Each structure stands twice: as structure tokens, then as C-alpha cells.
Structure 1
Amino acid sequence: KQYIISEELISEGKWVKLEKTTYMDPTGKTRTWESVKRTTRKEQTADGVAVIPVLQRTLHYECIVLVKQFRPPMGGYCIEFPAGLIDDGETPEAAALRELEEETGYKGDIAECSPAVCMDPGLSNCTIHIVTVTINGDDAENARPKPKPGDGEFVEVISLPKNDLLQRLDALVAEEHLTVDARVYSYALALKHAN
């Protein structure tokens, strides 16, 4: 019943652009919206991947590996899933294992890959694949995890036990001036609610 009428460019940046989206509401009455799009069209279906990295060791609890980055848009540090944009002609799976090794230094294995899911639907058309990845911590490969962080990327690795995640996050928020990614907190909330 609803659909897009027009998409008028307001301002194009280097990385991202702002557009006035005119659309038809269900009452046959037009409205507008301020929408964000990346300046460079994605060849790949979806824009990026968020990696859910599970650090599995014998004689240890299963840990979820997160990244503490300084995030200019936020003006602070955020705790997020290792994430990055998909290189042109590269499977989401390939991308997830690349972005993990780069951000954390961990060499993992695929578990499963989400369809494209919207990151910020009320602002952006950003879609990602949530890729579930296993890490064999007992393996030698993951003894000395050597990150290949790529240029201008300054990542601190934070592995937290799956069993205690939500409470362990609440502790880090209160203990530092930090912010948790909504998807990391959504994930952690489900782990408590599941048990």
C-alpha cells in the first residue's frame, strides 16, 4: 500500500549522502523522510557483516569476542561485534573471517550466516549479514592471535563469557565511559531470557 515517489539528493559527502525521500502513506497522502545512503553503491547484495565470534576452549567458559573502538559519530568508545564492509566480489562468509582476523587476530570457522538484516531502518538503508563464527582457542593458530588491523583502525579485543554476558556488560558500562552496541546488548539479553 506504501511505496517511494521520489529521492531528492540534499547533500553528498565523501562516504555518505543525505536524501529527501518522498513516499505514499496508506491513506493515499504523501509524506517525506530524511534518509542516509552510502555514496558508493554496493555491488554485493548487502553492505557489511557483523561477526558473532565464539571463543571455545577446554577448561574455560565459552567467551563472545567483542571490540572496544573509538567511534567519532558517538564521540566515545563503543563495544560492538567485529564488523566491516564487504569487499567487491567477496562472500559474506569470506568477509566475516577476514574482518575477524583483522580486528581480533583470530582465525575462525563459519557456523551460520544471517540473511541481509537492516542496521538502522529509520535512518539508513544499511543491511548486514550477522555471521556466527567459532574460534578453537586450544588450536595453536589462536595461541598468539596477531591482528592485521588495517589502516586507521584501532581495535581493543574484549572476550566475555557467554553465561555472564549481560551482567558483565552492565559492569563495563558503569566501570568506564563506554557504550554497548544495540545488537550486542540484544544478543546478551536473549542469552539471559533463554536459560
Structure 2
Amino acid sequence: KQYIISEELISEGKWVKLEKTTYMDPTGKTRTWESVKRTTRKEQTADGVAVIPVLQRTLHYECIVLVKQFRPPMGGYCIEFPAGLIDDGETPEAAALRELEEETGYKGDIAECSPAVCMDPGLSNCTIHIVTVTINGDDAENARPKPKPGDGEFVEVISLPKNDLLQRLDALVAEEHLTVDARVYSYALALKHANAKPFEVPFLKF
């Protein structure tokens, strides 16, 4: 019922651009909105990918591999799922495995890929593909990860136990005073909401 009437560039940098968006509301009226867009965005493609790397080992608990790095806009360190924009002539799945290797050194398998999902709908048009990659830690190819930091890419790898990720994250916060990514937290939260107090839920039924 609603649609975009027009978009006029307000300001543009080398990598990001701010635009004045004009759109038609449900009841005919016309309103404006300030929107953010990346200049690297390709037609019919998402801006980038995010990887949920489940480190697995035989007869051993799983781990979620995350990365910590300084983020200029935050003015401080952040804990995030490995990520990156999708390079030219690259599929989201391909990007996923690449960026995971570049930032962590691990080599994994695509387990599942999501459709394009938005990062901040009210602020930008940025979308990513959330890709779940399973890493075999028993494999010799993963015995000693060899990260490949690009120029300006300083990444600290952090492998956290999955069964109590949310708590590991809060521990990390209280100890280093850094910021957890909203997507990483959502995921951790969900794990707690489904795992925590197994017998507690089917107890009130009685």
C-alpha cells in the first residue's frame, strides 16, 4: 500500500551515503525520511555476510567462534560473528567461508544460509546473509588456524563454549568492558531461552 516516491542524495563519502527519502504513507500523505546506504551495494545482492561458526570436536562440547576488533564508529572494541562484504563475483556462501578463514584461519562447511536480512531497517538498507558454518576441529586442516588479516584488519579470535554462551558473553563484558553485537546477543539469548531450566517448564503443568 506504501511506496518510495523519490530519493535525493544528501551527502556521500567514499563508502557511505546519506539520502533524503520521500515516500507515500498509507493514507495518501507524503513524508520524508533520512536513510543510510553503502556505496558498495550491488544490485540484487546483499551488502555482506555474517558467519555463525560452530566449532565441533569428537566427544567434546561445541564452541561458537567470534571475533573481537576495534570498530571506529563505536570508538571501542566489539565482539561479533565473523563478517564482511561480499566481493565481486562471489556468492554469499563463498564469502562466508572466505571471511571466516581470513579472520579466524579456520576452514569450515556451509550448513545453512539465510535469505537477505536487514541490519537496521529504520536507519539503513544494509542487508546480510547469516550463514551457519560448521568447523571440524578434529581435522588436521583445522589443527592450527592460519588467519589472513587484510591491510587494516586486526582481529582477535575468541572461541566460546556454546552451552553457556550468553554467560560467557556477560563474563567477557564485565571483565573487558566491550560491546557485544546485537545479532550475537539475540542468538545467545535464544539458546538460553530454550536450553535453560529444562525441567522447569514441564513442572508447572502438574
TM-score of the alignment, normalized to the shorter chain, above 0.5: yes
Partner secondary structure for residue 115 of structure 1: coil
**In terms of mean alpha carbon deviation, does 75-84 or 57-66 score higher?**
57-66
Residue deviations 1:72-112 (CA, integer Å, cap 9, x gap)? 00000010000000111111111000000000000101101
Please say if residues 6 and 21 of structure 1, whose CA atoms lie closer than 8 Å, have aligned partners that are also in contact: yes
**In terms of mean alpha carbon deviation, does 40-49 or 159-168 score higher?**
40-49
Q: In structure 2, what is the Cα distance between the partners aligned to 1:33 and 1:194?
A: 38
Identity, in percent, stands at: 100
1:44 offset after TM fit, Å? 5.4
Q: In structure 2, what is the Cα distance between the partners aligned to 1:179 and 1:138?
A: 31
Q: In structure 1, what is the Cα distance between the partners aligned to 2:191 and 2:125?
A: 28
Partner secondary structure for residue 46 of structure 1: coil
Please say if residues 43 and 89 of structure 1, whose CA atoms lie closer than 8 Å, have aligned partners that are also in contact: no
CA 1:55/1:157 → structure 2, altered by over 3 Å: closer, same or farther? same
CA 1:103/1:181 → structure 2, altered by over 3 Å: closer, same or farther? same
Residue deviations 1:10-59 (CA, integer Å, cap 9, x gap)? 01101011000011111211111110111234145111000000000124
Please say if residues 40 and 47 of structure 2, whose CA atoms lie closer than 8 Å, have aligned partners that are also in contact: no
Residue deviations 1:117-154 (CA, integer Å, cap 9, x gap)? 00111111111110000010011111110001111100
TM-score calculated relative to the size of structure 2: 0.92
Question: Which consecutive unaligned segments of at least 5 residues does structure 1 have?
Answer: none
Please say if residues 44 and 86 of structure 1, whose CA atoms lie closer than 8 Å, have aligned partners that are also in contact: no
Q: In structure 2, what is the Cα distance between the partners aligned to 1:150 and 1:25?
A: 44
Q: How many residues align?
A: 195
Q: Which has the larger radius of gyration?
A: 2
TM-score calculated relative to the size of structure 1: 0.97
Partner secondary structure for residue 114 of structure 2: strand
1:171 offset after TM fit, Å? 0.8
Please say if residues 44 and 89 of structure 1, whose CA atoms lie closer than 8 Å, have aligned partners that are also in contact: no
Q: In structure 2, what is the Cα distance between the partners aligned to 1:124 and 1:143?
A: 40
**In terms of mean alpha carbon deviation, does 53-62 or 8-17 score higher?**
53-62
Question: Which consecutive unaligned segments of at least 5 residues does structure 2 have?
Answer: 196-206
1:60 offset after TM fit, Å? 2.7
**Pairwise CA RMSD of aligned residues?**
1.0
Runs of 4+ with deviation above 2 angstroms: none
Q: In structure 1, what is the Cα distance between the partners aligned to 2:69 and 2:44?
A: 26
Q: In structure 1, what is the Cα distance between the partners aligned to 2:77 and 2:178?
A: 5
Q: In structure 1, what is the Cα distance between the partners aligned to 2:24 and 2:150?
A: 43
Q: Which residue of 2 aligns with 1:29?
A: 29
Please say if residues 2 and 25 of structure 1, whose CA atoms lie closer than 8 Å, have aligned partners that are also in contact: yes
CA 1:43/1:5 → structure 2, altered by over 3 Å: closer, same or farther? closer
